Design a protein around this ligand. Structure first.
Ligand code: ANP
Ligand code: ANP
Ligand code: MG
Ligand code: MG
Ligand code: MG
Ligand code: MG
Lengths: 258, 258
């Protein structure tokens, strides 16, 4: 009569956060199976959009409408960028890098390429320079509950005039209130964290910082990186971040093993 | 007086396909520099959208509106998928794979994960099953004029009813006429190529094919893969595909080394 742990795990895979003892496993499972197939049928009949693609489109519109230039830069980057970011073997991230070939890696962050664009664009664009990128990033991780090895970052930045902590907090606040995500900014160049409960949604920086010089910067700047799968996890109340990932196993949080 | 080859290369970097002897290099270069900065200024002032992100959004809308479910699946995939696609050391692609770790690689195509979704979705969705994905793909290449090692694929597919060569050609035709790209379908399970002059835009398949069985398929299907950077190259008349790539060196076809 009591469900086994295995049976409970199985049912939890099929449980949407929205769902609301007695019946056997086969019955509980059968109920959940037809609910999930119905959810997928409804997606297919109406909207047809993937959550992660749709979030990316919504965030792009948010930033484009606020004067930020949309960037798409390489995902496979020179290994030299990692060192140049100050990620020496004395840091946590140095062990988390997926290397490709002798000279390349999968980007673990958007910073290097956005530094390069800020430098280059300063030669062409009026002050302030406002840019952002959304795209895949990669880190080896132990955790599986709040972490993915393949994830998606948003990074926005501004360089020149108006690069204040007040302006930075205001962008973050307008951003998260637009998405409808509850948050807290925590802090004391300047570095702050945007938290949902104990989940880190973003880390943000008020520059200048000494690293800028390695990238040829020399102007004040503000910026923040957010993980889109964490935003989805929070917004859709997914218990595990795997429901928000690029995946063959979940589609918009619905199990595909039906 | 005659421009050197180096000087000509430099000026060609700054030449947009749209542009229209006597003056020295410094003058020619200076003219082109202020034109390119002006192009970037105009992008920044008005639209702010990256070509590759914008093309992806336009193609997504095209397919979503035609009843295709939007998929986002992993870019880092099991190495076993490559073998399972029938890419043995007797093929060209086997040498083109970027391996990561012992067990992984960067996807060189979208097929494996879309096979997996067609199988899984058949258990939930009504006939026909219509899906697509747009995203990064990776192959080691010698060529640099029509090829990128980091590129972006669109793959759409349909499985079940209506999986005919006529329907396949019609989707392709409506698709490319929508984008405004000139093409020719060339062919004779069934395999056709969509060509722009001598440039291959797409390869398309009318299934079933014997490979399907390895992926648990067993239904008729149609599908095609297009490279988005080739579509941009053709549409914007870029002479080299690097102008259409994720890049620190070009933005919407405009040199960032100004
Ligand atoms: N492995 C991951 N999976 C999903 N999101 C991630 C992952 N790593 C980082 N992020 C997101 O990227 C944002 C900025 O990156 P960063 O500040 O470098 O992360 P971090 O400091 O390693 N955070 P954490 O590992 O939770 O302590 C983070 O706040 C997360 O939202
Ligand atoms: N390296 C690349 N760079 C840009 N686009 C590519 C690249 N490789 C493949 N594609 C695109 O993906 C589409 C389908 O992939 P596929 O049919 O496997 O390419 P292919 O047969 O290797 N074509 P090619 O190498 O030009 O002879 C191709 O028609 C191209 O539009
Ligand atoms: Mg971390
Ligand atoms: Mg952090
Ligand atoms: Mg090839
Ligand atoms: Mg081909």
């Amino acid at each position: 009569p009591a469900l086994t742990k295995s049976q409970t795990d199985r049912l939890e895979v099929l449980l949407n956060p929205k769902d609301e003892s007695g019946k056997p496993f086969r019955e509980l499972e059968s109920e959940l199976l037809s609910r999930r197939k119905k959810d997928l049928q409804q997606i297919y009949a109406e909207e047809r959009e993937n959550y992660l693609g749709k979030l990316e489109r919504e965030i792009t519109r948010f930033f484009v409408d606020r004067g930020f230039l949309e960037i798409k830069s390489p995902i496979l980057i020179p290994l030299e960028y990692i060192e140049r970011m100050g990620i020496d073997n004395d840091t946590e991230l140095s062990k988390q890098i997926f290397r490709v070939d002798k000279n390349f890696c999968l980007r673990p962050m958007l910073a290097p390429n956005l530094y390069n664009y800020l430098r280059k664009l300063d030669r062409a664009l009026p002050d302030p320079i406002k840019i952002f990128e959304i795209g895949p990033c990669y880190r080896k991780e132990s955790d599986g509950k709040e972490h993915l090895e393949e994830f998606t970052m948003l990074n926005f930045c501004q360089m020149g005039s108006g690069c204040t902590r007040e302006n930075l907090e205001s962008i973050i606040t307008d951003f998260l209130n637009h998405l409808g995500i509850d948050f807290k900014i925590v802090g004391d160049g300047d570095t702050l964290d945007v938290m949902h409960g104990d989940l880190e949604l973003s880390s943000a920086v008020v520059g200048p910082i000494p690293l800028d010089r390695e990238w040829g910067i020399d102007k004040p700047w503000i910026g923040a990186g957010f993980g889109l799968e964490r935003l989805l996890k929070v917004k859709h109340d997914f218990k595990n971040i795997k429901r928000a990932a690029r995946s063959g196993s979940y589609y918009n949080g619905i199990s595909t093993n039906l």
